[PDB]
Amino acid sequence: MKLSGVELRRVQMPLVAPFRTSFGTQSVRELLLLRAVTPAGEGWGECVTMAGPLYSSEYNDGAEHVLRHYLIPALLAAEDITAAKVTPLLAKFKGHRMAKGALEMAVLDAELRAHERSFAAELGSVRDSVPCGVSVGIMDTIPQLLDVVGGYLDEGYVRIKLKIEPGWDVEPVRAVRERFGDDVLLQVDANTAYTLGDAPQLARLDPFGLLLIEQPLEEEDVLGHAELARRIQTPICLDESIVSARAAADAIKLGAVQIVNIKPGRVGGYLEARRVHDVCAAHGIPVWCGDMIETGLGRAANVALASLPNFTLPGDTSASDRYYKTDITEPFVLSGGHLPVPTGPGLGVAPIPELLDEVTTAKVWIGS
Amino acid sequence: MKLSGVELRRVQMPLVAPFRTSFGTQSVRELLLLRAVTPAGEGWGECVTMAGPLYSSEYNDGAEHVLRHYLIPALLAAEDITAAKVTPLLAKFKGHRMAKGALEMAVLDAELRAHERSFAAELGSVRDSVPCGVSVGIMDTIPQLLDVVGGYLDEGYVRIKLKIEPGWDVEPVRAVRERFGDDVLLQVDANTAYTLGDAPQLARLDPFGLLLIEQPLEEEDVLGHAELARRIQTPICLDESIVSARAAADAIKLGAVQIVNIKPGRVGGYLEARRVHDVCAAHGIPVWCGDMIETGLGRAANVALASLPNFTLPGDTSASDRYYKTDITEPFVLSGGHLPVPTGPGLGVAPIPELLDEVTTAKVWIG
Numbered sequence: 001m002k003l004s005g006v007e008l009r010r011v012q013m014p015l016v017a018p019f020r021t022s023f024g025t026q027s028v029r030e031l032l033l034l035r036a037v038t039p040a041g042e043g044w045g046e047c048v049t050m051a052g053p054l055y056s057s058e059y060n061d062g063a064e065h066v067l068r069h070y071l072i073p074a075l076l077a078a079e080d081i082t083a084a085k086v087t088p089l090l091a092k093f094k095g096h097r098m099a100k101g102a103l104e105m106a107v108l109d110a111e112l113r114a115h116e117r118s119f120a121a122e123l124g125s126v127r128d129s130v131p132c133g134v135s136v137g138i139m140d141t142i143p144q145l146l147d148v149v150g151g152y153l154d155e156g157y158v159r160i161k162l163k164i165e166p167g168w169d170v171e172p173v174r175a176v177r178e179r180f181g182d183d184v185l186l187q188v189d190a191n192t193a194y195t196l197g198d199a200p201q202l203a204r205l206d207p208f209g210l211l212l213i214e215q216p217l218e219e220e221d222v223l224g225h226a227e228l229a230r231r232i233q234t235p236i237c238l239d240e241s242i243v244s245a246r247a248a249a250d251a252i253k254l255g256a257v258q259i260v261n262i263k264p265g266r267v268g269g270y271l272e273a274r275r276v277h278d279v280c281a282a283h284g285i286p287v288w289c290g291d292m293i294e295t296g297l298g299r300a301a302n303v304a305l306a307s308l309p310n311f312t313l314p315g316d317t318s319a320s321d322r323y324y325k326t327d328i329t330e331p332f333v334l335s336g337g338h339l340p341v342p343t344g345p346g347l348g349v350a351p352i353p354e355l356l357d358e359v360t361t362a363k364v365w366i367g368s
Numbered sequence: 369m370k371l372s373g374v375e376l377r378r379v380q381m382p383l384v385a386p387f388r389t390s391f392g393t394q395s396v397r398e399l400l401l402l403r404a405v406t407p408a409g410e411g412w413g414e415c416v417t418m419a420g421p422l423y424s425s426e427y428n429d430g431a432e433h434v435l436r437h438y439l440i441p442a443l444l445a446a447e448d449i450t451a452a453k454v455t456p457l458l459a460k461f462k463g464h465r466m467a468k469g470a471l472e473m474a475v476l477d478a479e480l481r482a483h484e485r486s487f488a489a490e491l492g493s494v495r496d497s498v499p500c501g502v503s504v505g506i507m508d509t510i511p512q513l514l515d516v517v518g519g520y521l522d523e524g525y526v527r528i529k530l531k532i533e534p535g536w537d538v539e540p541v542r543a544v545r546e547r548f549g550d551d552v553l554l555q556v557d558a559n560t561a562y563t564l565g566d567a568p569q570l571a572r573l574d575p576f577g578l579l580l581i582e583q584p585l586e587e588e589d590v591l592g593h594a595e596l597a598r599r600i601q602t603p604i605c606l607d608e609s610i611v612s613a614r615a616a617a618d619a620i621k622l623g624a625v626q627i628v629n630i631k632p633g634r635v636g637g638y639l640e641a642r643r644v645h646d647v648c649a650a651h652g653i654p655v656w657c658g659d660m661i662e663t664g665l666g667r668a669a670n671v672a673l674a675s676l677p678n679f680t681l682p683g684d685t686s687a688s689d690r691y692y693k694t695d696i697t698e699p700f701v702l703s704g705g706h707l708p709v710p711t712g713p714g715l716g717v718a719p720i721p722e723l724l725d726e727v728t729t730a731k732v733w734i735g
């Protein structure tokens with residue numbers, strides 16, 4: 001198509017329950033949505049950034065700005081657009097992966113709808129539903145965590161993942177293991193909150209049979225993770241460090257990772273995400289799908305992505321009401337601990353206009 | 369210090385001549401300056417960022433935004449403050465190294481002025497003056513290049529560095545070797561423009577005894593360079609990959625670099641730049657000072673940095689007049705292929721208000 005313009009929206013949605021990680025506390029989600037307009041039809045992208053630069057350097061105001069003054073203008077100046085051409089057209093601009101993948105997701109969605117083809121079919125889905133886990137924040141007390149972990153297990157979540165940070169690690173997993181025992185799929189995630197100095201502490205998690213420990217060290221610190229691997233029993237999983245398919249190939253070559261978390265926005269797009277999936281598959285490295293507290297737009301695309309063959313561990317693609325009282329799309333709802341892969345053209349879902357409007361804070365049109 | 373506030377201002381300065389790298393051409397230089405203000409006095413800082421995210425992901429408006437909504441408020445909220453404590457206070461915020469480095473510089477310069485100590489003293493200077501090199505852009509034609517380098521040599525620049533890119537690589541260096549011969553110190557700089565697939569092409573630079581090749585491959589591709597070093601004779605130098613002392617430690621362990629270009633802003637500040645120097649010194653890795661076309665404030669801090677003991681290759685830190693008709697500061701002027709280390713307390717220079725104001729585009733106070 002040609003790319004007529006992009007409508008860019010800021011959306012603010014109430015969380016059902018405040019969410020705590022090693023980097024802060026959230027109780028509302030502020031996000032950007034993009035509607036790409038083409039002669040052939042519309043498409044939706046969700047940008048995975050947050051309000052400030054706390055998980056990575058990208059954040060809502062920054063992504064809005066690059067999108068509006070560099071990325072979108074570049075795509076608008078282009079003679080031809082396809083989703084694959086987006087990467088080369090924007091290659092001149094360094095970084096901004098999450099912004100780049102928002103835009104690419106919107107162009108992809110417009111392009112597949114026009115061909116009445118699924119995100120799933122495009123990506124190479126091989127199954128119709130996917131097992132879902134849940135990610136449980138840091139709590140103020142051990143019993144609160146216990147009640148909470150008890151809730152999700154009763155709803156049928158198939159695996160539990162505990163946010164951790166210095167001072168909240170060995171106690172919480174021991175608690176969880178004493179209460180629900182050893183058969184429960186359990187893993188932890190530090191969000192870069194430890195250093196190689198903490199290896200003796202993190203080895204105190206050996207005896208608990210965790211599936212993985214996710215990104216214990218800082219995003220640039222790849223050799224560090226290869227080092228840590230040599231000193232702990234729990235397999236290492238990278239999240240923030242995997243910023244591209246090449247990144248994953250390097251981390252694997254260096255013995256820095258055994259299991260990869262794929263998050264599309266963080267790698268610059270669904271298309272690059274599939275490439276991470278294939279690089280990992282070629283080296284024997286299982287992957288699992290990550291979550292950025294997306295609305296139904298992103299959730300739909302992630303559930304599609306999670307259905308690819310090398311997703312061998314349950315992901316973080318929980319049901320909508322894990323985060324949101326009211327999703328802007330048809331919500332995802334757990335069933336036998338699975339979510340079903342969407343079926344129509346494109347994303348397989350679309351915003352319900354009235355619910356979107358209720359949550360829209362700002363709206364802006366970028367054309368020529 | 370308790371920190372009162374920071375006056376952040378945008379500055380635009382014209383360039384003596386178009387400067388063209390592998391990512392595009394530039395003819396003005398838009399930059400941000402920072403004025404930290406304490407109850408004692410003030411300090412200056414310069415952000416090395418450009419107008420768009422072409423050299424890295426950071427850019428003028430981005431830096432302005434973080435500085436204003438995150439970086440500076442975090443400083444003002446804090447009790448006592450020191451340059452060293454800036455890092456832990458800003459750590460919370462992922463990336464934005466150049467932004468953080470400007471604000472750190474500005475705070476350093478305040479701390480230091482109150483202690484009547486210069487940058488050179490604080491950083492560990494061992495020399496009074498430093499030798500300088502010149503960086504030469506991509507030209508339209510071979511003779512237009514030879515001409516420009518001819519000129520630079522005569523001005524007395526001790527070394528030449530040539531911008532390169534596919535289509536402008538072996539020919540220009542061949543040309544420069546014929547006109548000026550084997551004895552001039554010569555290096556090239558790709559700014560990211562090749563891939564490992566272009567190895568045979570870059571091996572073609574083997575015959576010409578280049579002292580290094582700066583950043584042939586992408587920023588994120590450290591393993592790539594280790595691989596390249598095995599297929600070419602020219603020593604590899606990294607610029608954009610080196611974002612911190614840890615990054616240099618890692619590039620050196622993986623055998624991905626033989627020589628390291630230090631840029632204070634790129635790496636998150638002068639305090640980190642020193643660390644990078646020291647990690648590189650500890651591994652026998654020579655370093656040389658880079659240049660981001662700074663004003664005189666940036667240049668004054670660079671010349672102090674470039675006088676640490678391990679800076680043993682000539683820096684990119686040219687004289688004020690290489691970029692600017694008029695500099696907002698007493699200009700730096702090439703004397704014997706050298707520049708002199710500033711001598712005043714702190715940065716040892718200050719912007720002269722008559723000229724700053726000529727060149728300021730906008731200005732905001734943050735209290």
Ligand SMILES: CSCC[C@H](NC(C)=O)C(=O)O
Nearest residue numbers: 021135136290291292293316
């Ligand atoms: C508040 S950031 C969301 C990032 C996501 N965590 C959640 C637990 O799915 C990832 O860090 O695993």
Ligand SMILES: CSCC[C@H](NC(C)=O)C(=O)O
Nearest residue numbers: 389503559658659660661684
């Ligand atoms: C304005 S472009 C970035 C600046 C710097 N080059 C010049 C040669 O000093 C770097 O490429 O080494």
Ligand SMILES: [Mg+2]
Nearest residue numbers: 189191214239
């Ligand atoms: Mg994570």
Ligand SMILES: [Mg+2]
Nearest residue numbers: 557559582607
């Ligand atoms: Mg360079």
